[PDB]
Design a protein around this ligand. Structure first.
Ligand SMILES: *[C@@H](CO)[C@@H](O)[C@H](O)[C@H](O)COP(=O)(O)O
Ligand SMILES: *[C@@H](CO)[C@@H](O)[C@H](O)[C@H](O)COP(=O)(O)O
Ligand SMILES: *[C@@H](CO)[C@@H](O)[C@H](O)[C@H](O)COP(=O)(O)O
Ligand SMILES: *[C@@H](CO)[C@@H](O)[C@H](O)[C@H](O)COP(=O)(O)O
Ligand SMILES: *[C@@H](CO)[C@@H](O)[C@H](O)[C@H](O)COP(=O)(O)O
Ligand SMILES: *[C@@H](CO)[C@@H](O)[C@H](O)[C@H](O)COP(=O)(O)O
Ligand SMILES: *[C@@H](CO)[C@@H](O)[C@H](O)[C@H](O)COP(=O)(O)O
Ligand SMILES: *[C@@H](CO)[C@@H](O)[C@H](O)[C@H](O)COP(=O)(O)O
Lengths: 218, 223, 218, 218, 218, 218, 223, 218
């Protein structure tokens, strides 16, 4: 399972890349605008991320119409071979995904909330589909059940689109995604750092070091 | 399923190897410090186990920092080709696993208590991952459930890291590991010995002896 | 299922009580210390909550020894008949719960992380037991499975201790708690506020407004 | 399981009432506005339905604020003892439901789309809660699953609010509601009439007729 | 589980009655037209079955309109208190059932092919509902699955209508009906006779006899 | 679960009764004829068993016709109040069971090989029904599955006939019968004596006695 | 579910009773002989436990014959009303249970390894039956499965004999017993102590202490 | 699935081999001692079986020490290429199996009672492993569950050791072994003889004979 970082914060990205467990990054207009303060410009933020991250970096178009989306997507593609163009699940978005797929521009269909939406994005040729589990949780539906159905559907038809679990809120979204077999999770930094930790690990380290000090003063 | 002995006791290790049922050994600093009493050096204990065991022998680093771990790991690797470097599930541990993996030094990520820790260790390229079932049992969760989920996750992604069930306390840990499909169990010597035994085996053996005396007073098979 | 509010924030409590959907309140030392800032004393915060809320209000002892816990518990009990004494799952805490229960002082055993701890709390006579699901989620274990087991154990022995699901982080903790049959959930305010909402509720109201305006322009 | 008709069409109600299979009626602002054309007035439609239906008749308030909802509810109540006041799942609606319940005015909480909304409606004392299965179907989630969860939740807490499955589109919604154990279904007239029919019933009737003509030509 | 005989043949009924395993009889226009030949009139056939059979005997109306069904049902009723009036699942049939139920005339709704039809008949007050499992098998649907759903539905609502499995073709319809818990099965004579038989029963009697000859040649 | 002894051997019966775990005895013509050798007569064998056993003793009739079976059954009844008359699953046997049931003579229907046969015996009023699990095993059908279905069927209709598992061959027939909830098992002597035994019991006894000898020389 | 302490150590027993979490005690001849060292008589150990424990205390007979068992059982019964006579699953044991049952002496059938043994003990009228889960674990079968079947069998027949899970080795035996619905578990002291503990409890306690020092330097609750 | 005959009785072996349904033979010291009576020597019995049976013939060592087992095994191997050396699951037995396997002498590990013992035997390189189901049944544990677990374990690791189900007592052991997928069953002669038979086979043949006699009196 690939693990991406769901942030535009340079420091978090830099920190997680230095850990060796971050395989890419996803952004969206709100994540970027959070960092585009104190004079920093959205374009610098994106270019800086594309540089630090050797894996896929997803960058969302802001136009809502087919022609604007394809033009922004070509501009995004031109920023680096690892850029992935994030495109909403809309009629124009599906059209743009199909056109960009033929141009060999990698794409990520976002704002997906049910399995048939995910299937339509895959049929348009999208590289990744991003169902938003946390926002389903917010409205009282277990979001992970949609991941499970998408995994079954994609397996049924040998679909090559990667399931990219997004809107992740806690380490159990991550656990369940791996158990289901989703291809990718993207996680906020606070979640990423928790995934390595467990109280019994720390307890165990402490006890092992005490045994070592019985045989080695240094 | 491979079966490793989880001890640093040399008499136990020779005895188990002699049965032909031990495929390797795991140690940790507490297991080693138990045997390093009355003049026995830790380094001699490690070197002796490496000598008598043909299979993998896991030896744990004691540094907690990335640099100390990789330096110590290269030294452990240098002691014999069957040495496997045991490294804890920490941020520095994962970085060390990735570096050592690329240097073709076999690694065993230890102190793992949930399936996502295990997956992270796999992603860093570790040779073996060791979830501690008995210590999960101690805190009131069925540790074998974590083995089951790890096996499913590894199957999903065709992960080559071997699942090495550790902190084994009883033969049902072993039975459930085999049914799940864990690659390896590491067991204390007391557990190892019990795996061979069953009261009906003893009983059947005595009955076959009694039957054979009816046909051969000296109990031999003359063919 | 009763729904408690898991905060010491007086404004949040007043709002949720005014919504009519809050059956009680849980606090803990960290929640209280968050509010006891810039002159506001912790004793005033506790008393104000007890006054506002008609339902049970859980207030945690701070001593770690049997004698200290019981003494603090009686002071807590004396603040109001709706006070419930929150006591940690420890050896002294069990002894304290047994004494307070024999004194007909309602108790709430907290910091519970597995079903056997919850059972021990029930055997000491505790009124409520509070397993922490979100903290279990944090360490890579699905906390709700512990609630499911506790419900089964409690059903097996006709246990009268109420299961109070705590450390709740999202509305699916709440949903799964109701499907399991937990007696109480205690929820932070941002979770509480989301429980009434659904985008199809908002949409349906807007469509109903359009139809009514056709037969009544006023 | 009670079966209500989901229409404001007086001919459909008369027809289905004359069948003896209709236990009540649900309306909503859009259903009424469809029939309030060519001089027909919403007040007369409502009064005529109340007159013809012995059982419960659900009439929805149009105000969105607590005080207007309660005042409308009392006027709806005054129109007949069989009237049930339909109130949306909103903060103000929950407040209205609680006030009307205490006044022994029967209520029906509408625009419910998940099981926790339904529980909050029951906790306010609502007589009926109406989850909208077809509108869930429309957005790619199997709406009957929410009915199943509500049934389990209500059973767990011995909740007396009746489950009134609404937004019904086909006879399988009806069948699944009956197998789950929902208290009430409300159905459009075209669904209602199909519930009695089956090709093998028609075929069997013709066969028995032919056999009867061999013994009695007349 | 009660067991009825599904035939109008007098010698079959008399034979099954002599065995003590027949609790009632069902007929229909075709079963009656098969025996009403060579000078035998349908009126004598019905009266003669009523006389032999102590328990319920179902006799079908031939009218297809409400008034005729109701008038015919009264004539059937007057023939004997064990007579049960069989009425088809139609609009007029439900109306007739409800009228006859208010007149304390036992009824049996026939030509039922799905569970919701069965529920409608129960709602009209019918004493027995008869789903046709064999005719569903004929069209490629496992008819026993309809019995299972009807059992669940009736259990859910504590429905007093008895499930009468009809159109039985083999002993496994009987086995499955009893495992499900259907109230009654009605069986053709060739099925009824087979129910008592098993080749290991025959073989066991032979062996027991052989042993008895050794100890007692008499 | 009651445990009966399936034998006519006086010594086995005497031995098992002296153990306190034998609640009754079942016989059949072959079991009796095995003991009716060296001059011993079948009548003495039966009378001797009726004397040693305070629980039900089943004694099979040898006639195959209704009138002979009832006359033999009345003779068997006259031998003692604990006698149970065993009667094969046949048309005449069912008739005899119904007649004897009215006379308050306890009966046991034997040679039952499927669940519908068991149901028919229960409908005739039989006290016990004896399905033969071992003889189904012999012909390649798991006999315990028939016990399971009979238990479900009898539970469904609150049937008071006791399920008496017969043709028992091993302790797993016994285990599965108890897990299913059969009322009675009847077991051959070699099976009965094995039920108390386990190697770990003997191993445990030996180890406990060695500890006792460390604190007590005697 | 009741929780008994499976020991004859008086310090353990007083300590557990003091927690208020021990509802009774089980002993056996090996547990008692462990404490009858350096002058301590077995009879004084039994009498002391009977004195300090308010709940049931199971004390095992040492005779293997029916007559010896009932005589010894009447003496055990006479030592206090909370004494429960522990009797092995044997032919003589079942006869002894039936006699003692009719004399209103509470009994605990021990050394049970399968569900039908348990049912036979119930049929003889025993108060408690003690299946040994840990010793089934030792021979490679999941002993908790036997508890589950016994619970089902007892439920089927409304049997009043209490299921007393014994030979408990870890907290998962306890957890699974509670989920199954066993009436009683008897546990060694080490297991008992672990049941109260969890690392997240410790961690949460330390964090609540730290929060409270921000509002009260002396860490007290002044109300 | 191969079917072996579990006996040393030469007449039974000749008969089963003549039936063409016997793929091999297993023996053990008790089975051989049963036949080696009244002058017949055990060495002649073994040699005669090896001659008659074309398939594998399992012959158990009698020594309990490694050196003795290996020496006896080579003498066994030398009697015929179809000899298989049966070795008990003991510490020395595992060592012996490992040595013999490296010498390409086929082995059969016996007295296996749980799945881990079977796994240990496979790891020593044994050709066949023989779990004893009937002896497990004897002690109140369903022996077939051990076969099910061994199959799963062996499948997990692609183990080439054949599962040879032994201590078989009835045809349902055989049926369940085939459904599980065990490689071999070894059966006593009275079990083997029953596997071909079924009362409906006999009945069907008799009916077919009657029909043929109508078109052909000869
Ligand atoms: C792009 C698609 O993978 C991501 O940046 C998504 O927008 C976020 O994962 C959405 O998460 P929130 O629901 O927390 O905004
Ligand atoms: C190394 C990991 O393979 C092993 O030595 C583990 O440290 C032990 O298995 C841990 O067991 P304990 O919980 O008994 O220390
Ligand atoms: C008291 C117990 O009901 C509560 O205040 C709990 O301490 C909190 O629910 C714990 O939540 P966090 O894990 O978010 O502190
Ligand atoms: C009232 C609630 O019982 C009903 O009139 C509902 O508004 C309708 O059932 C909703 O149906 P549509 O989704 O077809 O509007
Ligand atoms: C009346 C309903 O109980 C019955 O006589 C049914 O008409 C028959 O059972 C139908 O059987 P066929 O499908 O074989 O006509
Ligand atoms: C009477 C009915 O319970 C019993 O004696 C049965 O005849 C035997 O249990 C039959 O067993 P076999 O199949 O072994 O004869
Ligand atoms: C009596 C039965 O309740 C107990 O003392 C049992 O003997 C022990 O629980 C057995 O445990 P071990 O297997 O550890 O001896
Ligand atoms: C050799 C192993 O395949 C066989 O002869 C076994 O020993 C027997 O199958 C064991 O059967 P019993 O339990 O009936 O002795």
């Amino acid at each position: 399972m690939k693990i991406f970082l769901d942030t535009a914060n340079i420091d978090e990205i830099r920190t997680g890349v230095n850990w060796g467990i971050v395989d890419g990054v996803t952004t969206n207009p709100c994540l970027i605008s959070k960092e585009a303060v104190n004079g920093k410009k959205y374009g610098d933020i994106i270019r800086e991320i594309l540089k630090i991250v050797d894996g896929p970096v997803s960058v969302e178009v802001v136009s809502t119409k087919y022609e604007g989306m394809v033009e922004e997507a070509r501009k995004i593609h031109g920023l680096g071979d690892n850029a992935v163009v994030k495109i909403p699940m809309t009629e124009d978005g599906l059209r743009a995904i199909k056109t960009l797929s033929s141009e060999h521009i990698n794409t990520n269909c976002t704002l997906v909330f049910n399995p048939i939406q995910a299937l339509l994005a895959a049929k348009a040729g999208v590289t990744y589909v991003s169902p938003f589990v946390g926002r389903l949780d917010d409205i009282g539906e277990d979001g992970m059940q949609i991941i499970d159905m998408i995994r079954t559907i994609f397996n049924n038809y040998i679909i090559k689109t990667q399931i990219l679990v997004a809107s992740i809120r806690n380490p159990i979204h991550v656990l369940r995604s791996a158990v289901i077999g989703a291809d990718v999770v993207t996680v906020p930094f606070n979640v990423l750092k928790s995934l390595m930790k467990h109280p019994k690990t720390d307890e165990g380290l402490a006890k092992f070091l005490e045994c070592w000090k019985k045989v080695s003063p240094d």
